[PDB]
């Protein structure tokens with residue numbers, strides 16, 4: 001997260017870190033057994049780390065649970081990033097309390113102008129590289145479809161939306177991938193892609209979670 005703020009420990013209780021020996025992506029806990037992330041975050045051997053603030057220090061609220069299964073969206077295209085969503089099942093159920101909690105799925109899509117919270121452990125610089133240990137947060141609005149398409153001609157599908165600031169300076173970034181965009185207490189987006197980070201006229205692009213609620217529910221019901 002570039003141009004954000006330190007969230008505070010366990011203030012974003014649905015935020016998870018996906019670990020394969022190291023943090024590599026975010027995700028969102030949606031029930032005691034299941035995490036939503038980006039399909040471009042797929043790999044084998046994932047350990048889900050819940051209750052994290054400093055990802056390099058054991059602070060007392062962590063739950064580390066290996067994944068039993070990953071399900072990339074049936075129509076994910078890694079070239080275009082269309083359908084950039086993946087479900088991960090935990091081998092055991094997380095213990096839920098105020099520091100580790102699920103986030104609700106949307107019942108309706110969000111509109112341009114809605115304020116959201118984007119979070120993660122990704123790079124905090126727009127030029128060069130600095131990875132934080134503690135969770136970072138950014139409040140940002142959803143942008144209009146027309147501004148999003150204008151920013152990224154030929155690239156924005158109906159399964160994507162832009163959020164952030166066209167002036168630059170405030171965005172998600174590498175290492176935030178897969179993590180949440182939460183608006184009014186609902187998971188509306190997944191950190192997906194963008195051109196660099198925090199660049200002028202190049203806002204963040206996010207997977208439009210409301211399109212996937214049917215798939216998520218039916219997949220959980222049978223897996």
Ligand SMILES: [Ca+2]
Nearest residue numbers: 054057058059
């Ligand atoms: Ca920790």
